[PDB]
């Protein structure tokens, strides 16, 4: 739940199909509270917002490491 929304770290793909579930993914339309599609929009947004923020952090690391070797 909740984990999703505001949009620190969590797992991407593990959610990209938690959404597909709110759509039709393994082909059982349609349950839950579905996709306000407003919701879908602002979520997707968030996912990427983080997916990005991850790759950044990653890079920050590699570098902070790589230079720490130069020592």
């Amino acid at each position: 739940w909740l984990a999703s929304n505001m949009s620190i770290q969590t797992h991407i793909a593990e959610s990209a199909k938690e959404i597909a579930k709110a759509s039709g993914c393994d082909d059982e339309s349609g349950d839950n509270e579905y996709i306000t599609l407003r919701t879908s929009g602002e979520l997707l947004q968030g996912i990427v917002r983080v997916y990005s923020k991850q790759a950044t952090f990653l890079l920050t690391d590699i570098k902070d490491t790589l230079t720490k070797i130069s020592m």
Partner: protein, 436 residues
């Protein structure tokens, strides 16, 4: 099930208009031209809907009633819900208690409907303007109920940062090789302290076998051994030959390899997770059509039905590509809309937007002088149909055609004495009010 309404200092409503009941269904309003009728509904969505949200100074001032200044600071509005405003972000006095904007943001959706119903109102002579409205605009109309393009904005926007991010990914990617490299160096530099400790034992045992092997014989001179002789140099010759001393090579390589592994699992993860977001999208970009081309059905399927009420003389269908209205007013000969009478068009308008309004039916609806240009025939057909629609929802209309009246529920007039405008409630003599 609206509750009460009264104002203080809002637009032409100067001081107090404690001049309102009233209950569900077909409440109708009128009065003179620019008495404040439309201002009044402004009053309404003013509170109900976030059409009055951010915009600053000359916008925010306007609202407060600028009648030779006066108490420019005091502009209050009562529905049951109070929203006062003064000069500079003097916000909601929210329902006697007192809450926030973000608060009933949630509450209207859990009502509702919300901000979210865009056909919750309907002026403007727009209805009009929509005669004017051409094929593509129709699409829009539809989308904007299923919210669709408010969605589409996001999509594209994410999809940018998405493929924007993915250049960090490459900048990243570079750095890893550059790491892989720094461990390719830290590899040889352990190979050695390996091969090295290899020797200074390998050597240091020859050293100890021959300390024996050849003192063994001096043990006995008292009444592979050559192979080892020069082999013990072929060792010493190298520890002294090749040693950039470092006692840490297998410590410093243990950790700094672990991380490279830890990282290149993260690094790897990304790709995997990209290919899944990137996959998510198409799962949704499909769903959007599913959401639309579904509403479309519901809308058409309402439309005819609705139309065929208003004009049971002929039929109307919707075609789609990117949207059209096929039409005949009496079964005789049909076709496209961009051929019809001013008024002739104007019918559809309504129908349509009812057709639409009523597919996500909200608790409430208003209609600025929706009847301002259609003439006779229809007016009857409309007011009745609307009233029929009244049952289940709260309705509020302005009019100046009386034809909604010979049919109406409640009844209100607005009066303008030069600085104040007032609503007053009358009935039959109200209906007499116009006819004058």
């Amino acid at each position: 099930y609206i509750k009460r309404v009264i104002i203080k200092g809002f637009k032409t409503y100067r001081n107090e208009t404690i001049i309102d009941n009233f209950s569900p269904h077909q409440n109708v309003i009128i009065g003179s031209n620019g008495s404040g009728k439309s201002n009044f509904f402004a009053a309404i969505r003013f509170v109900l809907s976030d059409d009055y949200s951010n915009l600053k100074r000359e916008e925010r001032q306007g609202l407060i009633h600028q009648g030779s200044g006066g108490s420019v600071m005091s502009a209050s509005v009562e529905i049951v819900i109070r929203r006062t405003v003064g000069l500079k972000k003097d916000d909601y006095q929210l329902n006697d208690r007192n809450v926030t904007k973000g608060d009933i943001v949630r509450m209207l959706e859990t009502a509702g409907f919300s901000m979210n119903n865009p056909y919750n109102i309907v002026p403007q002579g727009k209805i009009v303007a929509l005669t004017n409205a051409k094929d593509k605009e129709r699409l829009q109309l539809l989308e904007d109920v299923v919210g669709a393009k408010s969605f589409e904005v996001k999509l594209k926007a994410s999809l940018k940062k998405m493929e924007e991010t993915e250049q960090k990914k490459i900048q990243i990617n570079k750095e890893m090789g550059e790491l892989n490299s720094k461990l390719s160096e830290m590899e040889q530099e352990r190979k050695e302290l390996e091969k090295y400790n290899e020797l200074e034992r390998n050597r240091k045992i020859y050293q100890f076998t021959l300390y024996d092997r050849e003192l063994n014989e001096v043990i006995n001179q008292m009444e592979t051994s050559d192979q080892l002789l020069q082999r013990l140099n072929d060792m010493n010759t190298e520890i002294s030959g090749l040693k950039n001393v470092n006692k840490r090579a297998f410590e410093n390589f243990k950790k700094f390899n672990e991380r490279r592994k830890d990282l290149a699992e993260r690094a790897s993860e990304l790709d995997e997770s990209k290919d899944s977001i990137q996959d998510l999208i198409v799962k949704l970009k499909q769903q959007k059509v599913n959401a639309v081309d579904s509403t479309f059905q519901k809308v058409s399927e309402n439309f005819e039905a609705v139309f065929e009420r208003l004009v049971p003389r002929g039929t109307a269908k919707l075609i789609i590509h990117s949207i059209s209205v096929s039409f005949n007013s009496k079964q005789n000969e049909q076709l496209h809309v961009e051929q019809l009478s001013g008024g002739q068009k104007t019918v559809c308008a309504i129908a349509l937007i009812l057709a639409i309004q009523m597919v996500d039916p909200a608790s409430f609806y208003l209609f600025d002088e929706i009847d301002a240009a259609l003439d006779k025939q229809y007016r009857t057909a409309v007011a009745t149909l609307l009233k029929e629609l009244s049952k289940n929802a709260q309705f509020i209309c302005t009019t100046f055609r009386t034809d909604m009246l010979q049919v109406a529920d409640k009844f209100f007039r607005v009066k303008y004495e030069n600085k104040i405008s007032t609503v007053i409630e009358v009935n039959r003599e109200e209906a007499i009010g116009f006819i004058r």
